[PDB]
Design a protein around this ligand. Structure first.
Ligand SMILES: Cc1ncc(C[n+]2csc(CCOP(=O)(O)OP(=O)(O)O)c2C)c(N)n1
Ligand SMILES: Cc1ncc(C[n+]2csc(CCOP(=O)(O)OP(=O)(O)O)c2C)c(N)n1
Ligand SMILES: O=C(O)c1cc(O)c2ccccc2c1O
Ligand SMILES: O=C(O)c1cc(O)c2ccccc2c1O
Ligand SMILES: [Cl-]
Ligand SMILES: [Cl-]
Ligand SMILES: [Cl-]
Ligand SMILES: [Cl-]
Ligand SMILES: [Mg+2]
Ligand SMILES: [Mg+2]
Lengths: 540, 538, 533
């Protein structure tokens, strides 16, 4: 009846859907045709949304966007060869950002490794320690009597792939390499003489159910000691710490309503630091975490705990708090937070030229509750932190794992599609929410291929990309001249609407109703930034 | 600083070892041998190429190595460099390309930049770490010897000087966070390793009806020059008796001599798997291919007795004329331009001495179906893993190294031409390879011909191209993109022109800017029927 | 500079719970001197061996004896290869093993550190300290960097944050105080790993508990087939031979089962839901039949009286069939020796079981694990290193009893192993005069002169009788008594009826009791028990 490659591909796709996979990114190939056929039919029946891309490296960052936008595991299926190697960059990012990314690689049978067979390499284990698991399905046997047993083993392995990627039993979500060797026949047989897919558990249940896991590690912390909370990427929400002064990275969730501008920390003298997540962005933050006199308590949601400090007195998951912060200490930190905010506000106005900070400040004001903000992990994240954005009621995403230039555009597109997707299922007939991306010009040009979306492929409903164009070791001689790439020409090539506006119009133009996907380019300056940052520092 | 001394010794020995080009990317950490390479660039001892995209940088290095046969260095500088260099390193492994990867590790920092993947173990020929530099005026003669000896190991491993198996090498130079000692006289390398002769004679009787199938990495065998030879475009031709690939299924060879690693044509793979046909594998290195475990014997050269029967050579020649006529006649009888028409136009426009860079998918297959005469012509293609990524940067590096070899011959004639034939998906995959800063070296005679059928044409010719999949194959296989290629080249400031297949000939004869892209629109909705008409007219 | 780094690291390892360290004489290795100072000062115990393989398995025993992390110090360019087996066992049995290495960063590399592939697949973490400097202006900062990293090593080995103990590779490439009151530099409270599973005990349920299983009070009433190394939670045991006689409709699987074919068949039956309750993040599956994973059970309902009565009946029939067929058998088999050891055990004893038949035979003899501590290398079920495992297990066990100030002599550690197992790791008996030696260790060897377990497998079928003596039985004809005397260890040959009384007498700290056994009748015995059911 049904050939083994088709049966295996349909069973795997079926178990992945039951595991919560709503979006799959597919790259074209011949060896992965079984997976391609099963995925396309699951897209026809509405069980998943399929995204086709041509460039596997940007496809991996699209899949990362599809996962951080709503929280679901996301699969990316590709053929054998360098197609798997091109997933390298996205796997590394997903490792340090803890993104549940499933690399579903088709492969030749392993017996062909070493024979010179076309388009065949050492795929299994290619990703080394960067993945949470390298799992290989077997080669499918042509034995309809073993069909019952193979369905159980295939579905149980797919569940193991899903459990490791989502961190269902480790609290350490990350990328997983799921390698599937496939042999001919690679296409489905004539459907008149066809079969039905071996069934899973009744009522759409996963083959192996993993109920919610709890990882608890309580820590004693006395709050009467003058305490500042520094929250970075992957930080959890802690209600018992919402009163304390908090220096929060843009991608960190806010526990309370007592902010502290990063520029204010070096001008204060905390006696005790509570570190939430993986702080990385601010240098004065990094300075304070080096100082050995100030005790540091680390609180993480997963088992990995950051090494950005040397005087880590203790690491846990939550705090059992004793006491309450001194009101004089609270008055001091709030006083200095207002002083830092005003210093940034005055020097921005006192500056003649539009810099990247002005663009970042303009986007911050235009934000509204419910919006999603995607930030290039270079300057845009630091700039929005200097402009003191209030991340309450907005979801802020950024590839803070390795903070690479790769794939920023694709991540924005993916996060938008995932966000607007979860808005449909909540039943609201209201319009889809907004996703605004702020990225530099060198990052936009570098991942301009990420703008490519085939005519038949899903397109974000309300994504606006704001490109702050500052036109910019012997390896730094390429930065000595402007790359001179017309942002509008790239957008025309990839059939994307573009507009070159000014920072004054940034607000009103961002409020124009949803026009699908669009790119807004703001011209900015880089020559005067050294004076602006020196002006702000002197104003403090 | 004893480290800047180390860096100057290594760069000198690498130049003595034949390295004429190095590729750099800006990174968070300082580049390995960053400043020493810069002095070597201004001195004219070496040519530096800088790129932003580390993936396109790896493939540019491959192009710089295969265009002239020299070893090439790429200097990793960031924490994403290992991941992005993966594709090029894998291709360098399977295509046997001398690729040196320079990295600088920090021994005073806690471990537990570089992001370690698992491929370095399986792909590289050697992993050599220099060692930390320490000041010692009484050991300058000794540290000069250790550094240059290890540098000679790195080059010998990468070029296959002692193994006959070129490939990528990982060279690590540890650094401590912040004149040149001499080498051998006359510019000679520190440790002279004479290239080795790797010899495996094999007895083959040529009176048995024999066909030769030469693939990637095949050698030149003068004693086999008379036999009917089905040769891939990248294989150097050794005779004047070509056998069209479509004529192979109309014959019954009793013996097959397989040169190098064949990767094209399903009739070839069916023949090589036939257990009733002895297959003899002749390779230039230690690796050897088998299709279905049907390689009877391995070697490097044939010790031949006998000669092909004149009746056998006549049958092969008759079947060859039928195949050539069928392709020419059916192409003329087809209204729409396909990628196969473009391949025949590019093939008829080449001249002796030109370089041809062929992308994967149909272009490299279509050129073979067009009967391209590869003699006097240098043909390149990344057949190691047959990826469609990095083919634009590979052509650019191939043009740059090929032109530099013509400059060093001192001929006043214009630089030789490099013509690249790639699909549209291939072009879209690595369009970023066109972004070259005005400071960097740019080719002077590179023409990229893009055969644009708005998607993946080869899938029309495979099993998923069957009409019973017509309703499902468009999205997941054809994958149209609707990209404006001229607008892309415009954005990157590359001369671009859309032309018809009839104007393709004369357009390549006229020179132009040192780099330009010629886009020919094509159709893939008639591809499967054009190929069926060719098979039936055989 | 390196002497200070080595002495800082040793202090944090002692503050982290390390009480024993194994090392081997090697071509080099500072850490040796620092470890030496702590040994004379009494802060750790040092154990030296010549055989690096046996050194790795000694450290495993030192870990599972009391539950502490243990360090082993490689010193040559053969230690990685020789420590391989012990690292693999530590990985699969979740044993806190710290492997200490020393790289040379000022030397040409790649043209005492032999790299194999197992480190990247077996260890929980790989942490290299980094080269030391000389500026005493940052000695306070270097102190924190070393003690923090050492705390990372200990946390990965003991599973402090991941609940998955295992081996760790620590590279120290070639006195600033710690936190006051001897606490570790970075405190990490042990983590609680929780997954509640809804299970209806009203369905006819059996509990199968294997290696690494936890203790479950709300499952104490259910019939329980428990492997020897499993800790028992209730008092309704179900003899393993009774399982094929019953027809359960639901299975709760604790830990990682590895024994008894009937169990493997039951766990694979697609008509029976299996629930895997584990103590860590890994979970086992036989044929993809595990339908849910968890760490504890939220139980509704109660077991039917009809189901419990049926289970108690077949249990009784099985214990009686084994106790009776063992009496009718004239020759002494390894199954008689397992029953003799089990009935000679008192509460508070430690029992070390080798693989092959000894671990299975003790289960067939129905030993009551309550009050006693069973140890076995069930991670990969190998016959190597079992002797050194029992020596280290004895040492750490008596060490925990010495530190409680009890006046009574050390508690008993009895090891039941086979002959092939004894020969495989006979070198582990070679212990120098200055090295620590157990004071209450008895190694009972059931010597049937070959592999008895093979007579019970398909190769033991009589149609292979003429072709299976060489390649499965493997007779050795080794004089165990002469071997023990050569290594200066007490040895005595006794009969099964003499095993109990001799075990009750305390003798030299290490004694090897060898009982002659037969395997030619093993397949016939087991066929007799099956027919008696
Ligand atoms: C990196 C990579 N990803 C995917 C593939 C699978 N693949 C093989 S041929 C092909 C289509 C290429 O299309 P195009 O370059 O337009 O060529 P055409 O066959 O249409 O001439 C694809 C995606 C590959 N070979 N390499
Ligand atoms: C290192 C290792 N090699 C081989 C095996 C395979 N094996 C399993 S049981 C066994 C026989 C051991 O015989 P013995 O220790 O005398 O025990 P018996 O079954 O006779 O009681 C062997 C070789 C193993 N488990 N470990
Ligand atoms: O001859 C060659 O060039 C060549 C190159 C390769 O990368 C091979 C890989 C596997 C098996 C055979 C191979 C081979 O024969
Ligand atoms: O529970 C345990 O102790 C345990 C231990 C292991 O080493 C495992 C290995 C693979 C699969 C499951 C495992 C498991 O459940
Ligand atoms: Cl950016
Ligand atoms: Cl014929
Ligand atoms: Cl190809
Ligand atoms: Cl066993
Ligand atoms: Mg195409
Ligand atoms: Mg035995």
């Amino acid at each position: 009846h049904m050939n083994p490659s088709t049966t295996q591909a349909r069973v795997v796709v079926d178990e992945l859907i039951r595991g919560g996979v709503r979006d799959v990114v597919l790259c074209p190939g011949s060896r992965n045709a079984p997976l391609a056929f099963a995925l396309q039919d699951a897209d026809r029946s509405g069980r998943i949304r399929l995204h086709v891309r041509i460039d596997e490296r940007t496809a991996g960052y699209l899949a990362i966007g599809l996962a951080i936008g709503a929280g679901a595991p996301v699969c990316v299926a590709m053929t054998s060869g360098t197609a798997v190697a091109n997933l390298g960059p996205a796997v590394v990012e997903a490792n340090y950002a803890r993104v549940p990314l499933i690399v579903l690689s088709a492969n030749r049978p392993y017996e062909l490794l070493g024979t010179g067979a076309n388009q065949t390499m050492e795929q299994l284990g290619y990703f080394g320690t960067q993945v949470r698991a390298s799992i290989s399905l077997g080669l499918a046997e042509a034995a309809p009597e073993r069909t019952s047993a193979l369905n159980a083993t295939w579905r149980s392995a797919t569940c193991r792939v899903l459990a490791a990627a989502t961190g269902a039993r480790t609290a350490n979500a990350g990328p997983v390499h799921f390698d599937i060797p496939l042999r001919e026949p690679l296409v489905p047989d004539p459907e008149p003489l066809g079969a039905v897919t071996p069934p899973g558990r009744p009522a759409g249940k996963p083959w192996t159910y993993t109920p919610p896991v709890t990882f608890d590690q309580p820590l004693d912390i006395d709050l009467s000691v003058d305490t500042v909370v520094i929250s970075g990427h992957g930080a959890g929400v802690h209600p018992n710490l919402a009163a304390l002064p908090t220096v929060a990275e843009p991608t960190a969730p806010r526990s309370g309503d007592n902010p502290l501008h990063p520029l204010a920390l070096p001008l204060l003298r905390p006696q005790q630091v509570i570190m939430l997540g993986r702080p990385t962005l601010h240098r004065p933050v990094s300075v304070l975490l080096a100082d050995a006199e100030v005790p540091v308590f680390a609180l993480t949601t997963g088992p990995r705990w950051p090494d950005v400090s040397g005087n880590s007195q203790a690491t846990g998951t939550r705090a059992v708090t004793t006491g309450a912060p001194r009101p004089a200490w609270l008055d001091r930190c709030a006083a200095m937070n207002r002083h830092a905010i005003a210093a940034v506000r005055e020097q921005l106005a006192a500056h003649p030229l539009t810099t990247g900070l002005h663009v970042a400040a303009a986007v911050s004001h235009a934000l509204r509750p419910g919006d999603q903000l995607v930030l290039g992990a270079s300057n845009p994240v630091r700039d929005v932190a200097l402009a003191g954005l209030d991340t309450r009621g907005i979801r802020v995403r950024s590839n803070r794992g390795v903070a690479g230039i790769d794939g920023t555009v694709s991540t924005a597109i993916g996060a938008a599609l995932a966000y607007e997707g979860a808005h449909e299922r909540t039943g609201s007939p209201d319009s889809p929410p907004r996703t605004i991306a702020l990225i530099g010009d060198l990052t936009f040009v570098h991942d301009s291929s990420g703008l490519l979306i085939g005519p038949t492929e899903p397109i974000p409903r309300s994504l606006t990309i704001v490109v702050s164009n500052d036109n910019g070791d012997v390896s730094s001689r390429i930065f000595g001249t402007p790359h001179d790439v017309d942002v509008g020409a790239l957008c025309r090539a990839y059939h994307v609407e573009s507009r070159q506006i000014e920072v004054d119009e940034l607000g009103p133009t961002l409020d124009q109703p949803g026009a699908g996907m669009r790119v807004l380019e703001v011209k900015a300056d880089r020559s005067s930034l050294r004076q602006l940052h020196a002006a702000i520092k002197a104003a403090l």
